[PDB]
Amino acid sequence: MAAPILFWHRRDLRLSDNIGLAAARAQSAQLIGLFCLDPQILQSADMAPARVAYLQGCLQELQQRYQQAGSRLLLLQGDPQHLIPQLAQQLQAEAVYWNQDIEPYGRDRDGQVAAALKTAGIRAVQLWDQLLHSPDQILSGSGNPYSVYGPFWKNWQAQPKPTPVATPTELVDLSPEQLTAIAPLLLSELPTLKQLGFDWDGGFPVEPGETAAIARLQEFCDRAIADYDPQRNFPAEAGTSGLSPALKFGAIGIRQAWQAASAAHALSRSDEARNSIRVWQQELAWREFYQHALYHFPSLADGPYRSLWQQFPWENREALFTAWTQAQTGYPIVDAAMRQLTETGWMHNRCRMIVASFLTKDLIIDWRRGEQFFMQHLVDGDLAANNGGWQWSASSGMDPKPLRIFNPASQAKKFDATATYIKRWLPELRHVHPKDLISGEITPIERRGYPAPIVNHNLRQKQFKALYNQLKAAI
Ligand SMILES: Cc1cc2nc3c(=O)[nH]c(=O)nc-3n(C[C@@H](O)[C@H](O)[C@@H](O)COP(=O)(O)OP(=O)(O)OC[C@H]3O[C@@H](n4cnc5c(N)ncnc54)[C@H](O)[C@@H]3O)c2cc1C
Ligand SMILES: O=c1nc2n(C[C@@H](O)[C@H](O)[C@@H](O)CO)c3cc(O)ccc3cc-2c(=O)[nH]1
């Protein structure tokens, strides 16, 4: 009990399995939560309507959970460097708790806020919550960060795994006197999506909120997971969890997700299952690899990390970029993926690799243009993972690899052999023959209004290799 402790939420929108929140409840029952609508983020051109819609639904639930627990979630709108210390001063808060992040913006903001709180004589405690292992814990024998997945995985996998922490209960709300002291800093109501200027009708991979995310984890683990491998390969198959946005925003705790995978892996008697489960567990490790990477090498966010890739002579033809964004490339597998993206705010992972390779190696456009278009549409848009996926398409950052220019055709054959996914997103081509949809060779008569390939794959492959080889001669 005692004076109030403020817990500042940002990307951990849940009451359960929250490290910082659990640590705070151990210090006082007068635990008040807050979320600050930050214009520097919400007004950025990098916002996606699906993503704000998801965020807004998570906050609605969180307001309720706090009310049910005994206190409330305070809502502010403005610059946190200014509003957080002021709010804490007015409430003479004993401390302000929050969970650390890996993003440059987040880390700079947090330092300023912490500095301001100290100046005010108020304690700020920042703990690690969104990762099973913090960036400081996973280092090589020489005490250096990993820039290659292999060694990172062997280390990460051998570390003892933490257990989910308890959900705080029996909280005590603020008094009328305290509410009066802060009234001028508060928002009276959670704004609606239209009030923020966004609209979204495309649905979600998982419904917003802590309850839904938890329900989905349980469900994925009682059935799906067992078949993860190889079901995750096929875009037509609903083989993945659909939890990506819940993990981006912390609607589900990472220790709860790992624990569920552990349990499922033990109850499983089939060796095939035990494998699908271990494959999903590695996907959680890829997530941390990319988050630790941005933490250790922040410059990654600025563009190509490897020097030569910084000098690459991208062609950058706007006309090709536009057709890409509009799903008018003429390459079925590609256009189908781009339609799923813009219509639903989500895209199967195999398709993200395919459209990324396409933009970088076929269209020869600086991948940063693609990185930004993705952030503007993805419900799970996440700087670390998106930047990691795009650097991947060019081997310009972490975990590099030898050149390999994909053939959309081949990929289609491999992952959409029957063209089910393609026709799902390109109905105007339902009449066409799989063989044709996979190959991309459609007769002008049965293919309709649908465009012809905007580029010739083989001519593009040579062009790219040529630009790449010329360059290698001056590095
Ligand atoms: C170009 C590109 C951009 C990407 N952008 C994002 C993005 O902005 N946000 C995002 O969450 N993921 C991104 N990824 C990875 C991506 O494929 C997603 O994690 C998505 O497919 C998850 O769907 P799911 O939740 O069903 O995944 P599952 O297969 O169920 O995996 C479970 C969780 O593991 C994590 N994960 C899975 N694959 C990866 C991966 N390759 N890298 C990092 N984490 C991974 C995610 O948190 C995911 O929710 C990107 C990948 C590429 C190639
Ligand atoms: O504190 C906030 N965090 C927001 N975040 C959550 C976090 O990513 C976080 O603030 C930072 O750590 C990002 O550096 C958003 C993330 C999105 O992708 C989209 C919108 C937001 C909006 C906010 C916001 O208004 N306030």
Which ligand has the nearest atom to the CA of 48?
2
CB distance 261 to 221 below 8 Å: yes
The dihedrals phi and psi of 125, each to the nearest 5 degrees, come to: -115, 125
CB distance 28 to 34 below 8 Å: no
Which ligand has the nearest atom to the CA of 243?
1
Which two tokens mark 154? 């062997």
Give the residue from 247, 189, 190 showing the smallest Cα distance to 217: 247
Instruction: Tell me how far apart the alpha carbons of residues 249 and 129 are, in angstroms, rounded to a whole number.
Output: 12
Place of tokens 């957080």: 84
Classify residue 85 by its DSSP letter: H
CB distance 326 to 363 below 8 Å: no
Coil, strand or helix: which one is 230? helix
Q: How far is the CA of 135 from the centre of ligand 2 (A)?
A: 20
Write the DSSP string, 301-331.
Answer: GGS--SHHHHH------HHHHHHHHTT-SS-
Q: How far is the CA of 10 from the centre of ligand 2 (A)?
A: 6
Determine if the peptide bond prior to 230 is cis (ω within 30°): yes
Catalytic residue among 390, 392, 425, 456: 390
Q: Tell me whether residue 177 is in a domain.
A: no
The dihedrals phi and psi of 41, each to the nearest 5 degrees, come to: -95, -55
Instruction: Tell me how far apart the alpha carbons of residues 415 and 237 are, in angstroms, rounded to a whole number.
Output: 10
Experimental resolution (Å): 1.8
Give the residue from 27, 22, 15 showing the smallest Cα distance to 165: 22
- Name the domain count of the chain: 3
Coil, strand or helix: which one is 69? helix
Instruction: Tell me how far apart the alpha carbons of residues 232 and 213 are, in angstroms, rounded to a whole number.
Output: 19
Give the residue from 74, 78, 75, 82 showing the smallest Cα distance to 116: 82
Q: Tell me whether residue 430 is in a domain.
A: yes
Choosing from 281, 297, 313, the residue where a domain stops is 297
Q: Tell me whether residue 91 is in a domain.
A: yes
**CATH number assigned to the domain comprising residue 407:** 1.10.579.10
Q: How was this structure determined?
A: X-ray
Q: Same domain for 27 and 77? A: yes
**Ligand 2 test: best mutation among 7, 11, 382, 383, most atoms within 8 Å of CB?**
11
In 204-264, at which residue ranges do the beta strands (DSSP E only) sit?
A: none
Known catalytic membership, residue 390: yes
Q: Give me the helix-helix angle, 367-375 and 383-392, nearest 10°.
A: 150
**CATH number assigned to the domain comprising residue 271:** 1.25.40.80
**Ligand 1 test: best mutation among 216, 240, 283, 368, most atoms within 8 Å of CB?**
283
Known catalytic membership, residue 8: no
Known catalytic membership, residue 237: no
- Among the atoms of ligand 1, which is closest to the Cα of residue 220? 30
CB distance 88 to 117 below 8 Å: yes
Beta-carbon-side half-sphere exposure of residue 69 (alpha carbons within 13 Å)? 24
| Host domain of residue 76 | 3-129
Q: Same domain for 326 and 346? A: yes
Q: Same domain for 305 and 405? A: yes
Exposed e or buried b per residue across 169-186, where buried means at least 16 C-beta atoms within 10 angstroms of its C-beta? eebebbeeebeebbeebe
Sheet containing strand 31-37, edge to edge, reads: 73-77, 31-37, 5-9, 95-99, 123-127
Q: Same domain for 286 and 144? A: yes
Q: Same domain for 44 and 32? A: yes
Which two tokens mark 281? 């567990």
Q: Tell me whether residue 174 is in a domain.
A: no
Q: Tell me whether residue 186 is in a domain.
A: no
Q: Same domain for 265 and 335? A: no
Q: Same domain for 248 and 370? A: no
Q: Same domain for 414 and 285? A: no
Exposed/middle/buried for 9, CB within 10 Å: 0-12, 13-18, 19+?
buried
Number of neighbours of residue 158 by Cβ within 10 angstroms: 7
Known catalytic membership, residue 367: yes
- Give the amino acid at 293: A
Choosing from 104, 129, 154, the residue where a domain stops is 129
Residue 207 neighbours by CB under 8 Å, 6+ apart: 57
Write the DSSP string, 144-181.
Answer: ---SSHHHHHHHHHHSPPPPPPPPP-S--PPPHHHHHH
Which ligand has the nearest atom to the CA of 83?
2
Q: Tell me whether residue 76 is in a domain.
A: yes
Q: Tell me whether residue 449 is in a domain.
A: yes
Classify residue 191 by its DSSP letter: P
Q: How far is the CA of 466 from the centre of ligand 1 (A)?
A: 32
Instruction: Tell me how far apart the alpha carbons of residues 156 and 277 are, in angstroms, rounded to a whole number.
Output: 17
Which two tokens mark 286? 């890829």
Q: What is the largest CA-CA distance in the chain?
A: 76
